[PDB]
Amino acid sequence: HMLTNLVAEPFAKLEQDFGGSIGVYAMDTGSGATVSYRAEERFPLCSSFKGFLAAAVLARSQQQAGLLDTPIRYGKNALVPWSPISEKYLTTGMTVAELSAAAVQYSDNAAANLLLKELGGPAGLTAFMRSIGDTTFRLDRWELELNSAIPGDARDTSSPRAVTESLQKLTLGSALAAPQRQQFVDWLKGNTTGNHRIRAAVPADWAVGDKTGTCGVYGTANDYAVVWPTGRAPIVLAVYTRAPNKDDKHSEAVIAAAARLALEGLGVNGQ
Ligand SMILES: *[B@@]1([O])O[C]([C][N]S(=O)(=O)N2[C][C][C][C]2)C2=[C][C]=[C][C]=C21
């Protein structure tokens, strides 16, 4: 507690102007100081689970030395909406590593469902998260059904705090072996979908990797990231949003603004 919210930030005004709820957890991994706002509330994961999915595949590859190189063929029936990479390889197949990169860096839905199948489905990914000490995360459904973002529904949700804690374990801690850890970091660094979210608050001369989520309803969207400010320890953070009405729109600008407030609350001079 002593190092949580040392400096208050106007998250309440931000979410009120947005018309919904914003949840933020940010950890300075050097000092342990944190910024926390609605951090233990549940928010829909949307596509943000795909980062943890790729980490779970990497963990399995530590015991299967050839998993990542395995070529996966799939039929047209596997190609659900928003599969920008896997649709270009329908007639050829893709490797497990390539599907993992596509799921992370393009939020590819067909790739995500194929990898979920490899792990034993939503319960298998949930089990991986339990194995690293995350008791909050739950995945319940497949793409696209997991995006329903129904108010009060705990299916396919986690909390900003648990997302940040798990992301820290996987990218900076010991939950993955060192080669797999760096591969997960590199996939996050290569994400293409997050330029208007946490990255928009991060100076260009700092390294950053992220994974976005966008449910398409209930103003529900999110991003989590690891950030390496130069000259100090990395920061891990999660920013999740939702709103009360099905037709409410999400806002990338609100996510970027919340990330700025988190960095400011941690005293990390940047944006
Ligand atoms: B999941 O949240 O990420 C993808 C991409 N989302 S999006 O809002 O960036 N998008 C670009 C235009 C169409 C969708 C996705 C796609 C569908 C369902 C869930 C997710």
Q: Whose CA is nearest to atom 7 of ligand 1?
A: 214
Experimental method: X-ray
In sign, the C-alpha dihedral spanning 266, 269, 270, 271 is positive
What domains are there in the chain, each with its CATH number? Answer: 2-268 (3.40.710.10)
Closest CA to 261 of 25, 16, 20, 95: 25
Question: Relative to the CA of 48, which ligand 1 atom is closest?
Answer: 2
Residue with tokens 């999400």: 250
Distance 252 CA to ligand 1 centre (A): 13
CB 162 within 8 A of CB 137: yes
Distance 1 CA to ligand 1 centre (A): 36
The CB of 193 under 6 Å from ligand 1? The reply is: yes
CB 201 within 8 A of CB 182: no
Question: Relative to the CA of 221, which ligand 1 atom is closest?
Answer: 2
Q: Establish whether 50 is an annotated binding residue.
A: yes
CB 193 within 8 A of CB 101: no
> Hey, which residues are catalytic here?
47, 145
The CB of 222 under 6 Å from ligand 1? The reply is: no
Strand partners, 222: 213, 240
Q: Which amino acid is at 132?
A: I
The CB of 47 under 6 Å from ligand 1? The reply is: yes
Q: State both tokens at 13.
A: 């005004």
* C-alpha distances out from residue 237 to 1, 23, 161, 217, Å: 17, 11, 8, 23
Distance 215 CA to ligand 1 centre (A): 7
Of 79, 107, 108, the residue with max ligand 1 atoms within 8 A of its CB, to mutate for a pocket test, comes to: 107
The CB of 82 under 6 Å from ligand 1? The reply is: yes
The CB of 214 under 6 Å from ligand 1? The reply is: yes
Q: How far apart are CA 134 and CA 15, in angstroms?
A: 27
The CB of 142 under 6 Å from ligand 1? The reply is: no
Closest CA to 221 of 235, 211, 233, 231: 211
* C-alpha distances out from residue 206 to 203, 214, 235, Å: 6, 25, 11
The CB of 46 under 6 Å from ligand 1? The reply is: yes
CB 230 within 8 A of CB 243: no
Q: What is the three-class DSSP state of 65? A: coil
- Residue 237, CA atoms < 13 Å, CB-side half-sphere: 33
Q: Whose CA is nearest to atom 20 of ligand 1?
A: 47
Distance 87 CA to ligand 1 centre (A): 15
List, in order, residues 6 or more apart from 237 with CB less than 8 Å away.
Answer: 24, 25, 26, 27, 35, 164, 198, 224, 225, 227, 259, 262
In sign, the C-alpha dihedral spanning 146, 147, 148, 149 is positive
Q: What is the three-class DSSP state of 174? A: coil
Distance 236 CA to ligand 1 centre (A): 23
Q: How far apart are CA 66 and CA 15, in angstroms?
A: 46
Q: Whose CA is nearest to atom 8 of ligand 1?
A: 214
Final resolution, Å: 1.0
